[PDB]
From a paper:
Galectin (Gal) is a lectin that binds to β-galactosides. Because the primary and tertiary structures of Gal-13 are highly conserved among all galectins, it had been named galectin-13. However, our crystallographic and biochemical experiments (solid phase experiment, hemagglutination assay, and biolayer interferometry) proved that wild-type Gal-13 could not bind lactose or a rhamnogalacturonan Ι domain (RG-I-4) from Ginseng Pectin. Primary structure alignment showed that a highly conserved histidine residue was modified to arginine (Arg53) in the ligand binding site of wild-type Gal-13, which may be why Gal-13 could not bind lactose.
Tris has three hydroxyl groups and binds in a triangular shape. Aside from R53H, the double mutant R53HR55N also could co-crystallize with Tris, but not lactose. The Tris molecule in R53HR55N occupies a different position compared with Tris in R53H. It seems that Arg55 plays a role in stabilizing Tris in R53H. In contrast, Asn55 could not stabilize Tris, and its hydroxyl group points up in direction. Here, we found two Gal-13 variants (R53H and R53HR55N) that could co-crystallize with Tris, that also has three hydroxyl groups and shows a triangular shape when bound in the ligand binding site. However, the hydroxyl groups from Tris could not be merged with the oxygen atoms of lactose.
Numbering used by the authors:
A (entry chain A), B (entry chain A): 2 to 139
Write the structure that this text describes.
Amino acid sequence: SSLPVPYKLPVSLSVGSCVIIKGTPIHSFINDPQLQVDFYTDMDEDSDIAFHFNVHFGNHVVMNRREFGIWMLEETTDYVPFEDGKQFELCIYVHYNEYEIKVNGIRIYGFVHRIPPSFVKMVQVSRDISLTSVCVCN
Amino acid sequence: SSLPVPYKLPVSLSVGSCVIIKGTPIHSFINDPQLQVDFYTDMDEDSDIAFHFNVHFGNHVVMNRREFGIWMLEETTDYVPFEDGKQFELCIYVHYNEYEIKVNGIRIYGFVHRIPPSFVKMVQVSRDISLTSVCVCN
């Protein structure tokens, strides 16, 4: 892996930013690998999370947020267009009202902001992947 | 322009980071346009500058740094492989001992760190360009 995992990246996010994550699952899909992305409001892992994203490859995605230290109401989708054993490109685009999640160019979900995305100061990419690159673009 | 100019981007830089700047000069080369990139240590424009970069299109590049508010010894190169009127790609790659400057895939200079690049908290892109995109990658 080009970058260590858990990869904790300090970020500054604004409307129009894109977080592009490129990596490869480290286990085949029959082994139920996961990929987790957390939009943290501080480098401390107990800080609030504006957007939590856990892909269960070949299964579903679970999304949530943590406010005043409390996990809020979980959201899910079954649209998991990741391919077994291949590199993926995961793009999280910050619109004025939501994070748009695109997997390999395919939009799968729009997670609405309950706090402004400019409150995000760290993005952590974790779990069962090898990372080739992470870019924050505007 | 997709992004306003002067564009002041909060950043976090580490060894292995790449700053990729894509834009177009807003004047023809006979009009002596410039492109300036400042690696600032804080959002305040009077803060120290780890790496200052001013392209005089069709002419030369001037580089310097500002320490304790004082401009240090200026460095220059004549290698300015920008094309008149075209979009450029300016990549600044942070190695352990230097910033590598690549213009349109062409390495033109290596500006050695006199403070650690992790001290850079803001990158400002300014002067005679229209910006299509700025990405910070690892």
